[PDB]
Motif scaffolding. Structure first.
Motif, PDB file in Angstrom:
ATOM      1  N   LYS A   2       0.835  -1.234   0.000  1.00  0.00           N
ATOM      2  CA  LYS A   2       0.000   0.000   0.000  1.00  0.00           C
ATOM      3  C   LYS A   2       0.862   1.275   0.000  1.00  0.00           C
ATOM      4  O   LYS A   2       0.445   2.256  -0.587  1.00  0.00           O
ATOM      5  N   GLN A   3       2.030   1.259   0.615  1.00  0.00           N
ATOM      6  CA  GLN A   3       2.823   2.453   1.019  1.00  0.00           C
ATOM      7  C   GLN A   3       4.268   2.146   0.662  1.00  0.00           C
ATOM      8  O   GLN A   3       4.635   1.001   0.862  1.00  0.00           O
ATOM      9  N   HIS A   4       5.000   3.071   0.052  1.00  0.00           N
ATOM     10  CA  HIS A   4       6.306   2.833  -0.622  1.00  0.00           C
ATOM     11  C   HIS A   4       7.446   3.541   0.111  1.00  0.00           C
ATOM     12  O   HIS A   4       8.617   3.462  -0.372  1.00  0.00           O
ATOM     13  N   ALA A   5       7.131   4.223   1.218  1.00  0.00           N
ATOM     14  CA  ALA A   5       8.101   4.915   2.102  1.00  0.00           C
ATOM     15  C   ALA A   5       7.530   4.965   3.530  1.00  0.00           C
ATOM     16  O   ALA A   5       6.324   5.020   3.697  1.00  0.00           O
ATOM     17  N   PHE A   6       8.386   4.935   4.539  1.00  0.00           N
ATOM     18  CA  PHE A   6       8.012   4.826   5.967  1.00  0.00           C
ATOM     19  C   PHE A   6       8.923   5.742   6.786  1.00  0.00           C
ATOM     20  O   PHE A   6      10.154   5.759   6.561  1.00  0.00           O
ATOM     21  N   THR A   7       8.307   6.491   7.695  1.00  0.00           N
ATOM     22  CA  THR A   7       8.989   7.385   8.657  1.00  0.00           C
ATOM     23  C   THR A   7       9.361   6.549   9.866  1.00  0.00           C
ATOM     24  O   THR A   7       8.812   5.426  10.020  1.00  0.00           O
TER      25      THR A   7
END
Lengths: 170, 170
Positions: A2-7
């Motif tokens: 779902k999401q291609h970068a993470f903090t």
């Protein structure tokens, strides 16, 4: 997928079991967590066309491992740079939506040919997924490199991580 | 070559630089230290006739890594069992009387085929020295196994550790 970068806060939520849900792949929490952010994750491209992770760890002189490793000779343990690569392959398996808890299963060749001093700014992990296997047990095989401030210092070939469901003893 | 067994306090003294002297091989201090005692060290015998280490780590549920690795799923990180084997090969090079600081240089094949749960009593490391090389840089090559309460769970072939003197950048 779902999401291609993470903090960092996404990864802390992952460490609590709240990104992929309980009984699915978790990152470790501090002080075993060796990632601050995932800059890129995909299930296509990379060296082998089977996916890629790019992740970062910020370095400062006060990171816990510098004081105990070693007194008078601070250096990031190679084993923790290696572990970041296992952490990221585990994260990849959870991110694909596979169920179960992550265990490192090993690697082929590991080489350490440089070091992370407490004067460094940033460690970068590059993971190339080679193969996923969906047998009895789900596992991933990857190659990885660790770089400090642009410079390659570690490599691992055939990093293996496996997923163990609620019924799987190890 | 003087002493063939070491207590925790001997290893803590080693971590301070006070066993082999400053600028020589050091064990890490807690929390990176993964050994409580060396039960046997020799420069003869072992699998290859080039020396052997047998070392132990006592397990209890309160060891730091169980809480963060992972929340709700405590297991000793494989990377720290692997690191104990690098720590012991580094200790071996210092124990032979070679000068310089220890760095892990890598390994051939690593396999994790079991786990250390917080219910375990004791981890045992068996290191078989394969070769030492006294070129430009001094290094050791070894095979190692990690066992928990009698049961083999990890193996590493071609563990490499190198010694770096005061003039050696890495």
């Amino acid at each position: 997928t779902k999401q291609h970068a993470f903090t960092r806060e996404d990864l802390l939520r992952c460490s609590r079991g709240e990104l992929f849900g309980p009984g699915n792949a978790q990152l470790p929490a501090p002080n075993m967590l060796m990632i601050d952010r995932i800059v890129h994750i995909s299930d296509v491209g990379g060296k082998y066309g089977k996916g890629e992770l790019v992740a970062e760890l910020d370095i400062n002189p006060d990171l816990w491992f510098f004081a105990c490793h070693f007194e008078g000779d601070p250096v990031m343990p190679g084993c923790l740079g290696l572990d970041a690569m296992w952490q990221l392959v585990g994260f990849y398996l959870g991110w694909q939506g596979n169920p179960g808890r992550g265990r490192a299963l090993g690697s082929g060749e590991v080489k350490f040919f440089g070091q992370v001093l407490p004067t460094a700014k940033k460690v970068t992990y590059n993971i190339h997924i080679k193969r996923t296997i969906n047998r009895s047990l789900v596992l991933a095989i990857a190659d990885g490199t660790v770089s400090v401030d642009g410079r390659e210092i570690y490599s691992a070939e055939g990093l293996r991580v496996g997923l163990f469901t609620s019924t799987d003893s190890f």
